[PDB]
Ligand binder design. Structure first.
Ligand SMILES: Cc1cc2nc3c(=O)[nH]c(=O)nc-3n(C[C@H](O)[C@H](O)[C@H](O)COP(=O)(O)OP(=O)(O)OC[C@H]3O[C@@H](n4cnc5c(N)ncnc54)[C@H](O)[C@@H]3O)c2cc1C
Ligand SMILES: Cc1cc2nc3c(=O)[nH]c(=O)nc-3n(C[C@H](O)[C@H](O)[C@H](O)COP(=O)(O)OP(=O)(O)OC[C@H]3O[C@@H](n4cnc5c(N)ncnc54)[C@H](O)[C@@H]3O)c2cc1C
Ligand SMILES: CC1=CC(=O)c2ccccc2C1=O
Ligand SMILES: CC1=CC(=O)c2ccccc2C1=O
Lengths: 188, 196
């Protein structure tokens, strides 16, 4: 199928970069794969609207067309990013802000939202340094993107994979987490 | 006391802009107040680090020095923003990422984190279209910034003021909300002081 990897990290020799390689290398050659490196793209995450440039027409903003086109083309989205302050890094938050706009990703109905990206699925791979037991007692940590961003847009299902205590553990342990990510990627 | 309002909205004629105006106008004159319009500042919310520019050095990044010094100066921070996708607009999220860095806003306890912004308190003013009953149940909606950002950095107390069904309510009801903001603002006072 058509696969869009949206990758978020400033350092090309990061552990998250390593996670990107695992996915790319283990994705079947039957898939058609494009990677969107937000940092390398120099993506501008700051959403702007006014009376001059109306919110209503955010769906037709020229600079964002390439990214709208990438999302519409994809059948399965894979997000790779570290948890910064319980959440997506700013560049990735703004990818959503700017690209997932009304009349493109969803529309307003009588009561709530109507999703428009149906037929689409996603996989979220997050890294962070919070222990696994602590996780029921925390806000977001990938759950906002999954539960309150991708789902409302009709994208289903969404698998959320957290690699936890990621700095406290050993290289050895991180290699094992890399192996499982490769494994999971293989069985898609 | 020293009050830093961090304001986040791309539209100078937005409702959020009206909330800012209500806050600025109703703060006691005994306070020294500084407003940081992230959008007017053309704030770059994209945190950069790598081999060349180590994460270790972030608390010494040049462009962000203006914004570290504002935080240090403040006794009280008021955050004003619309909820976008359950949380802070990207530009404000990057404000946290780039400014509230290790060795400035916090550092590492033998076990967890040690906040470095003690002596400060905050007020978060949010707008959104979700019913208030849903607030205890939705992820974030200002709860991350209050509970998992400001608190760990040793900022306390933190007041969370949510203006709900903001676009669904009437224009009289929105004006009523503005009155509520103005009145809370008038009560931002040092202990045993009255509003000047
Ligand atoms: C602004 C900011 C905010 C943060 N807020 C949160 C908070 O809300 N929640 C909390 O849980 N965490 C928080 N953190 C920490 C963050 O989640 C981690 O730093 C991150 O998830 C690790 O991913 P990375 O690619 O950046 O790791 P890197 O720093 O690149 O590497 C991490 C570790 O893996 C190693 N490594 C790299 N490659 C390999 C390999 N091939 N094999 C084995 N090991 C390897 C490294 O050498 C290192 O020890 C925050 C960090 C920042 C900078
Ligand atoms: C990218 C994006 C993502 C979003 N995600 C979420 C979601 O996660 N959850 C959901 O609950 N919300 C969501 N929203 C909606 C958002 O929270 C609201 O649009 C916002 O909070 C309203 O504040 P505003 O300043 O932008 O409103 P504005 O559009 O600027 O104005 C709103 C209303 O108030 C009126 N008004 C202006 N001034 C006054 C005044 N002085 N007195 C009385 N009325 C006045 C206006 O004329 C108007 O009818 C999202 C919006 C965007 C753009
Ligand atoms: C809540 C939180 C905030 C951080 O800035 C942070 C930075 C580095 C490691 C862990 C953390 C963390 O758990
Ligand atoms: C989940 C969600 C996402 C939105 O983009 C949004 C936009 C405008 C009003 C409400 C909402 C909302 O409830």
């Amino acid at each position: 199928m058509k696969i869009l990897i949206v990758y978020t990290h400033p350092n090309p020799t990061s552990f998250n970069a390593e996670i990107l390689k695992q996915v790319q290398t283990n994705l079947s050659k039957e898939h058609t794969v494009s990677t969107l490196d937000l940092y390398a793209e120099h993506f501008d995450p700051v959403l702007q609207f006014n009376e001059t440039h109306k919110r209503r027409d955010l769906a037709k903003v020229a600079e964002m067309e390439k990214y709208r086109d990438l999302v519409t083309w994809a059948d399965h989205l894979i997000f790779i990013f570290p948890i910064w302050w319980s959440g997506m890094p700013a560049i990735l938050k703004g990818f959503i802000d700017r690209v997932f706009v009304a009349d493109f990703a969803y529309s307003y109905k009588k009561v709530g939202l109507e999703g428009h990206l149906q037929g689409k699925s996603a996989w979220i791979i997050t890294t962070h340094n919070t222990p696994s037991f602590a996780m029921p007692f925390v806000q977001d940590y990938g759950k906002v993107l999954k539960k309150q961003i991708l789902k409302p847009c009709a994208i289903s299902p969404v698998k959320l994979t957290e690699l936890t205590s990621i700095e406290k553990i050993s290289d050895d342990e991180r290699q094992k987490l890399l192996h499982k990510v490769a494994q999971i990627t293989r069985n898609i």
